[PDB]
Amino acid sequence: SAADRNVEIWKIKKLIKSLEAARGNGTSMISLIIPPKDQISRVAKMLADEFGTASNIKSRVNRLSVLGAITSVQQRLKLYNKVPPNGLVVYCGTIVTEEGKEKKVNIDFEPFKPINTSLYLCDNKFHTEALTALLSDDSKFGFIVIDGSGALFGTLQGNTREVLHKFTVDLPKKHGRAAQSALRFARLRMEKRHNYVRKVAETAVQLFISGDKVNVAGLVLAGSADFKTELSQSDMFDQRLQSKVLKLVDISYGGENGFNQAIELSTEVLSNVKFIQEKKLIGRYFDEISQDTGKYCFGVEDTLKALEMGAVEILIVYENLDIMRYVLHCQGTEEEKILYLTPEQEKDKSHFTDKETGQEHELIESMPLLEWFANNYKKFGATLEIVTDKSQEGSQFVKGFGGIGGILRYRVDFQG
Template structure:
């Protein structure tokens, strides 16, 4: 293995000004790059190259030997990545991570092997922002990873998002927890229990519209929240005339004074926020401790 120590370099990245420092490990089958990004300043810490084993002749026996040598060298390469990550992203004085978050980027095969073999320090696993697959290695892969995650890395947004997700999933883990999730559950509490919601969390790309409809037979006003798929189902409009249609995210922003809380927007780019958007419908709320849900209401 050849470890090349590089010098500090800086590069302007538009509006990415933040005090948060993120660590990046970019890796593929040819080498690994260890860097940090703080605002618009990048620091290249180490570059590790992987020397592929030479072919050991021809024939079945030689192929087996080549495979064994390759696996031994790969294990050593992955162990070196894990050790260098600990060396550069753990403060030796405090024993704690020295970065706000950590991003693994590169070949998915290498990433899977690294995590599967348990070669990554558990203190750094807790700091993982995301694991992204990029088409390139080393410097070009670093640029691609930044581009993919630019909206969450900019202006300290990750710190706020991590704080919100920690609070929300902290309530989810409690029994009972003071939280609601999903469109129906969240909107029911907002509409029926003013002041009950302490923190309203919404995916910034929530693709749901709020409909105000009137039943053509009874004259009753009906409120529905429909995603794209549901909008294509004619059963959702049976005997109903649409009087108003508005993106739910926009409606929540307009009505924040009535509910006493403005929506806190999150991306789906971190592990926690991706789980929130995928498994919790991208909308949920932390409830005020002084407000209790009635019997039979799900949280």
């Protein structure tokens, strides 16, 4: 199910947030990650040697803690018999926290999504940078590799390199050694070749489409010999699939040996997709401002109000955003209020005396707003869109408009 996947993603996001905060002493923590194809025996051996090396670390507190961390991860790996699909992630350590509570901790988990990253690290903190990068990059891309020998279809997350399907073909020879038949054989050769293109296109429709709408956000044709060209510029290739064709890549090799080549050449064009979608989005937002319309809104004080009411269609946010949702509470009367505060207005603020009654109105701790948007944008209108500061329109949105706004479902008036 899709909802169950979303819950698992959120659980793991929460888990990562708790691990980032952790911290401990020296280099006690053991950030370990395993890729899916890898053998467990090989990792178990590695850890055993690392345990051996640690067995002469001059320090006391560091050494013992590290040995016990490596001991624990080795035991965790004994519980598995193979590295599960999606890879494995193991985070062992001896965390310090409040109440002087030097507690040991071990979190192995099969992560959501296939990850391609190996990692071993020891440090004072847990290294959850690779995971956060996989959570950000959800843009799957598709990869068709054409060749006279045989095709290949595959997919490509930020890290992960998939193979969906492939075939080979027994195509005819270039030449026909009869004068009259040369013409006919040539026409027959061109028909067989077109039927191959037709077959490839049909297989692409089967694979890359999901519920009459393409799952992949990009689509790379690679190969040689103006064959990938035939696929892009052809009426047989379906337009809904064809419209997202981003590169035609000239490679050497064919099949899996060329798949990686095609990725490397295509890497620059693939990274630019997110940037283009941002430009289109913010460009559409700024259209409304250029004309009268009045659909657009901006700033927490306005955009949230718009969101509460006659809702937004699209809510556009900067990635980073400072602004934070605090929960203010009264000592005596039990009155409360929530406010969305900037970095200066949140850090120190004499505003929060109750005034009417005459008491100190204590600010009970925050949940950060952009996270707040992510929590319950389903509650409001929907389509939470994060955008960077890189594009010229994006930089305007961040610097000028404060990195927050929304495109509204209908016209709205405002006051004050």
